[PDB]
């Protein structure tokens, strides 16, 4: 039998581990191991976002998950949306624990510009946020920009190809979050020796209404990847709209990083 | 077109509003209004269970939902498992807002024994807690007993007839909870003039492995209902294993209390 892999899955801002509830059993039925991280103030994490004042604090449960792996184990690290930023922060700390980073409908940062750069670029040309609620929270680290998605924005821009049940679930579970853009704009740039050394692929949905295909090509042109996979018909929440096709993409990646 | 109704849906201990993600759109597509309540320290509520020391505090979100209804509106109030206790507490406060109580695989308290009676009986009877973790927390008014479901327990006793994705989702979202047995033992008996005045029906799954079909009969024998509905092949989490059959039962209940 083909050697199986351990996938570590990292969710998007304002969501939680729960988003992987369709994908996780598909991977485990194929014989792979899956860890679905719950970031700080996400899902059922007990902290409010107001208590998590920096991106490193946000990302700590992922760093802990990697720190805790047995010696010499390497994972397939999948980051979704803002999850791309978290996996890049993880790869600058534990590069040798990661076989390949998988940027799934994700922010793909570089090692030349400040770590906020690709978010700043998107926020400039984002289109509408709809009924999304923006608020500020003042901290010792400076002012944190918070957001709470609105349900019309969710339906139109994130979940438009998802079953109604998944949209209802999402309504029931999403939380106020942050993209930590202030904090990312002050952080030291991601390193070529850490992050930049790790193998990376991109998986894009063809109907992502949040992270459009032109912006993705821009990111990749600033920071190349070894291969691009496309999921036809996926919305942004591709693990909910097209879990099987996502499985297929992940499987194809895993067959490339046998070794 | 026949008259539609507002269903207020109340989840079990250690879960949250999310359990209703399948049922809610089935009920709304038929023209009914649904409010899926999140109780305190449940789901994404921001409190820990330790902070909610009394069943009244636990149930506050449900009381608030009922208080906020316009004048003269009446709902079908569905309580699932522990949710039976919550809906009896609500019916003792706002009996006039409730067209009918639906006890869904639920604890069905009486107006004769102390409020904890049916919980205390199940706890004497039941020998399948498995890898459930039991613990205490001392409050200024007494010991509060807590529980955290174990995953094996969940699979065997609650989710055995659910899709594997539902079980994975539940692993991702269940929380430490409580049946408030000490607080319920100290509380005034449920009243005849409030709770006991409201119409009530029971909906039972035929394969409930935590609230056994014989114990349901014992409760109903102890405190009668207008009508009993049975969902064939449902496990305890029948809104996840048999959501269309549950929708059928609720649709039948709405037609008997039509107005
Ligand atoms: Cl995001
Ligand atoms: Cl319960």
Curated annotation (Swiss-Prot), chains A, B:
The active site is at residues 81, 236. SUPFAM superfamilies: alpha/beta-Hydrolases. Keywords: Lyase. Homodimer. One of its GO terms (biological process) is response to wounding. The gene is HNL. InterPro entries: AB_hydrolase_1 (IPR000073), AB_hydrolase_fold (IPR029058), MES/HNL (IPR045889). Belongs to the AB hydrolase superfamily. Hydroxynitrile lyase family. This is Alpha-hydroxynitrile lyase. It comes from Arabidopsis thaliana. Involved in cyanogenesis, the release of HCN from injured tissues. Displays R-selective hydroxynitrile lyase activity. Also accepts nitromethane (MeNO2) as a donor in a reaction with aromatic aldehydes to yield (R)-beta-nitro alcohols. Gene3D superfamilies: alpha/beta hydrolase. GO terms for molecular function: mandelonitrile lyase activity. The record marks 208 as: Increases basicity of active site His. It catalyses: (R)-mandelonitrile = benzaldehyde + hydrogen cyanide. Its EC number is 4.1.2.10.
């Amino acid at each position: 039998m083909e050697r199986k892999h351990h996938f570590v899955l990292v969710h998007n801002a304002c969501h939680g581990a729960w988003i992987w509830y369709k994908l996780k059993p598909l991977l485990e039925s194929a014989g792979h191991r899956v860890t679905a991280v719950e970031l700080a103030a996400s899902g059922i994490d007990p902290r409010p976002i107001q208590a998590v004042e920096t991106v490193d604090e946000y990302s700590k449960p992922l760093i802990e998950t990697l720190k805790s792996l047995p010696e010499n184990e390497e994972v397939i690290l999948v980051g979704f949306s803002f999850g791309g930023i978290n996996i890049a922060l993880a790869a600058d700390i534990f590069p040798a624990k990661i076989k390949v980073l998988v940027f799934l409908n994700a922010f793909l940062p570089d090692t030349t510009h400040v770590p906020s750069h690709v978010l700043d670029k998107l926020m400039e040309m984002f289109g509408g946020w709809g009924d999304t609620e923006f608020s500020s929270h003042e901290t010792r680290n400076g002012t944190m920009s918070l957001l709470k998605m609105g349900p019309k924005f969710m339906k139109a821009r994130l979940y438009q190809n998802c079953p109604i049940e998944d949209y209802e679930l999402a309504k029931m579970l999403h939380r106020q979050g942050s993209f930590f853009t202030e904090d990312l704009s002050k952080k030291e740039k991601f390193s070529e020796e850490g992050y930049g050394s790790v193998q990376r692929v991109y998986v894009m949905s063809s109907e992502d209404k949040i992270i459009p295909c032109d912006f993705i090509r821009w990111m990749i042109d600033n920071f190349n990847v070894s291969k691009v996979y496309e999921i036809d018909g996926g919305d942004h929440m591709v693990m909910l709209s097209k879990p099987q096709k996502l499985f297929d993409s992940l499987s194809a990646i895993a067959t490339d990083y046998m070794g």
